[PDB]
Design a protein around this ligand. Structure first.
Ligand SMILES: OCCNCc1cccc(Br)c1
Ligand SMILES: OCCNCc1cccc(Br)c1
Ligand SMILES: OCCNCc1cccc(Br)c1
Lengths: 237, 300
């Protein structure tokens, strides 16, 4: 059934699971034509497929060529997403395949269910959580690889960097969702918070800065302030 | 014109013969139904006065034998049986016809309702859905489940309708996932029509039988089947034009006959709005859409 606050520790048990987010698969700019009509131009996208226990991010880059000559692109995008997730599962050893796939938007359920009929033991689930995975394209290194791609491509990341050496999966996912919620509510402020100190660098093989335990607490507190602030500047509270 | 003779009516009962119904009082001098039109299947159905729960009945064709009803006080129901002694049966029926102990199938001359509801229904196909090979007639009740209902518990008392499941490997060609799910023509025309039913007449016969079982007995499995068979056609972009025209006629007479006070339960809002207003065939069912809009505009 649906994933919600009441079964939140299930994410970090030992049953392999993946979140799938399709919110950045089909991306467009809208612009005026010479005749004063409106047109779209697609730009590269990505499927965001994440193991919340390990941090392993399977980032499938969606190159704009895949939309050429196609109609009803928003509907096609959900089926393209489902096709790519199904291909990923089939490419993994059986012992690495997920027991459950949690989609962040309900319109992915039927496309993924149909693409995974070959896998009746894999549960396809929605969630009542409003997870901020759309903001993945605010992580500079992920945005960079997506926009540079000249062809379809799969890139593998650990979105937790080395955090699991020091904290549990539950805490790593809580930090990740707090960072992404901040980047979604005010990207510039969020990014300023993350870089304001020139002495704390991002290692070549990481996505986020090399904060100490103490500095992560500071950062996390400032990110919560921002989310509360913006919530006041938004609702005038 | 054929006759179904009754040994007697020991318990008070509402008796149904096709779309007609009448009441018999306990121990009333009732000995059956005469003037039944040859050339159509028929259904004789029952609702006990003292336990209005569980309607039950028998599908039969008078060309296939001499049938009669006799109450069983151990099992507590009116049972259909077959008399193999023809001369005995004709003599019995003649005695009751002379004493005027039988009601008359009151078919109005102008009236093609039953034909129109049963055009494609054939006893031989009924007997494949309702498996009870020793009898020429077929028993159905309110509570009987379908083979697919049993997949989601007695298999001998099941309704063996054709399983239709839109999210199944039968319905979806590897590599045509989006195509086949959004346009069900492959599943309709290749899997179901060419592969399983062989022709549209067999498909329409099962569709009509499911509706009649759903309406006469309140059979949940039959209602699910009728709606699924409508939805498979409406969700196919490519349907032979003669099938669409005939479907419109079929559905028109089913909606016309439905008692107004059971529409609430016999009609699935989602399937009908989808079929009439969103589907590929939203503009293809002119007669059915006009009667639905004039009779049941709440549902829509
Ligand atoms: O005494 C003969 C009873 N045989 C059963 C039966 C056969 C034909 C018609 C009817 Br009514 C009942
Ligand atoms: O309540 C409607 C009454 N139906 C009239 C009727 C009466 C006797 C036999 C048959 Br068959 C039908
Ligand atoms: O709320 C579901 C209760 N089952 C009764 C029923 C429902 C729909 C059609 C038919 Br026929 C029978």
């Amino acid at each position: 059934g649906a994933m919600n606050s009441s079964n939140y520790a299930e994410l970090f048990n030992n049953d392999i699971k993946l979140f799938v987010d399709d919110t950045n698969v089909y991306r467009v700019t809208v612009h005026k034509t010479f005749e004063g009509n409106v047109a779209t131009k697609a730009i590269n996208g990505c499927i965001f497929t994440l193991n919340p226990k390990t941090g392993h991010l399977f980032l499938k880059i969606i190159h704009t060529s895949v939309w050429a000559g196609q109609k009803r692109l928003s509907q096609l995008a959900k089926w393209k997403t489902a096709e790519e997730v199904s291909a990923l599962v089939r490419s993994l050893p059986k012992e690495e395949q997920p027991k459950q796939i949690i989609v962040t938007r309900k319109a992915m359920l039927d496309p993924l269910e149909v693409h995974m009929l070959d896998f009746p033991n894999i549960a396809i689930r929605p969630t009542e959580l409003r997870l901020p995975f759309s903001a993945a394209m605010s992580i500079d290194k992920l945005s960079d690889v997506v926009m540079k791609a000249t062809e379809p491509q799969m890139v593998l990341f650990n979105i937790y960097d080395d955090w699991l050496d020091r904290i549990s999966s539950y805490t790593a996912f809580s930090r990740l969702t707090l960072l992404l919620r901040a980047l979604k509510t005010n990207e510039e402020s969020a990014k300023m918070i993350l870089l304001s100190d020139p002495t704390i660098t991002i290692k070549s093989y990481h996505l986020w800065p090399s904060f100490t335990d103490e500095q992560w607490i500071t950062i996390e507190s400032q990110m919560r302030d921002l989310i509360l602030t913006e919530y006041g500047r938004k609702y005038n509270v | 014109m054929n006759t179904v003779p009754f040994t007697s009516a020991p318990i008070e009962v509402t008796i149904g013969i096709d779309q007609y119904s009448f009441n018999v009082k306990e121990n009333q001098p009732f000995h059956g139904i005469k003037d039944i039109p040859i050339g159509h299947v028929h259904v004789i159905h029952f609702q006990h006065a003292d336990n209005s729960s569980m309607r039950y009945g028998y599908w039969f064709d008078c060309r296939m034998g001499n049938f009669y009803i006799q109450y069983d006080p151990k099992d507590g129901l009116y049972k259909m049986m077959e008399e193999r002694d023809g001369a005995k049966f004709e003599n019995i029926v003649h005695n009751f016809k002379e004493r005027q102990m039988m009601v008359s199938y009151p078919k109005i001359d102008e009236d093609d309702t039953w034909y129109n509801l049963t055009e494609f229904v054939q006893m031989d196909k009924i007997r494949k859905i309702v498996r009870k090979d020793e009898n020429q007639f077929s028993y159905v009740d309110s509570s009987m489940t379908t083979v697919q209902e049993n997949e989601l518990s007695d298999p001998a008392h099941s309704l063996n309708y054709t399983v239709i499941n839109f999210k199944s490997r039968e319905a979806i060609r590897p590599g045509h996932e989006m195509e086949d799910f959004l346009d069900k023509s492959y599943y309709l025309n290749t899997v179901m029509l060419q592969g399983i039913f062989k022709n549209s007449s067999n498909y329409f016969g099962e569709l009509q039988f499911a509706f009649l079982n759903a309406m006469f007995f309140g059979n949940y499995g039959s209602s699910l089947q009728w709606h699924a068979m409508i939805e498979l056609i409406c969700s196919s972009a490519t349907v032979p034009k003669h099938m669409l025209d005939k479907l419109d006629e079929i559905l028109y007479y089913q909606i016309k006959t439905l008692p107004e006070q059971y529409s609430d339960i016999l009609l699935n809002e989602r399937v009908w709005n989808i079929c009439l207003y969103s589907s590929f065939q939203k503009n293809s069912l002119h007669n059915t859409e006009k009667i639905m809009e004039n009779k049941y505009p709440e549902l829509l």
